[PDB]
């Protein structure tokens, strides 16, 4: 029920993830607690302002403190959700006892090996292009997740 999504700055992706589904899984009553983290992350940062307004649009309110992934987090953490493969090794080199939780977003709800990539430094359309992306995928998530009886 606590899940962690997790990218490399924790500005973008990550933040945007931990927002969309708050949204979601509220609407839909999952007892989930959601965080995030970056792998190479420096804390006191703000989600980007593209990623802001991304959510914005969307009327949900993107605050947001950047954060490293670290021991603790990995121990309490059910699922951890990373963007890429590449995040996902990352993770699993520095955390290794806790590899068995950490999975790609997309493999984890689609099946499929494949990448959210990076939308650092992109336009306000390339941002929104990635939530919807990350919406699609969240919904998703949302439904199989009610289907864990680690819900409590």
Known sequence: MDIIFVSTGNTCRSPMAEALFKSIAE????????????????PNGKATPHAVEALFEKHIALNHVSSPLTEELMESADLVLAMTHQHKQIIA????????????????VTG?????????????????????????????????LKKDRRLE
């Open 112 to 144: 499929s090996h494949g990448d959210v990539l990076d939308p650092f430094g992109g336009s306000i359309d390339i941002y929104k292009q990635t939530r919807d992306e990350l919406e699609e995928l969240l919904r998703q998530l949302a439904k199989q």
């Open 27 to 42: 609407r839909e009553g999952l007892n989930v607690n959601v965080r995030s983290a970056g792998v190479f992350a420096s």
């Open 93 to 108: 080199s520095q955390f290794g006892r806790y590899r068995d939780k950490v999975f790609t977003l997309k493999e984890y």
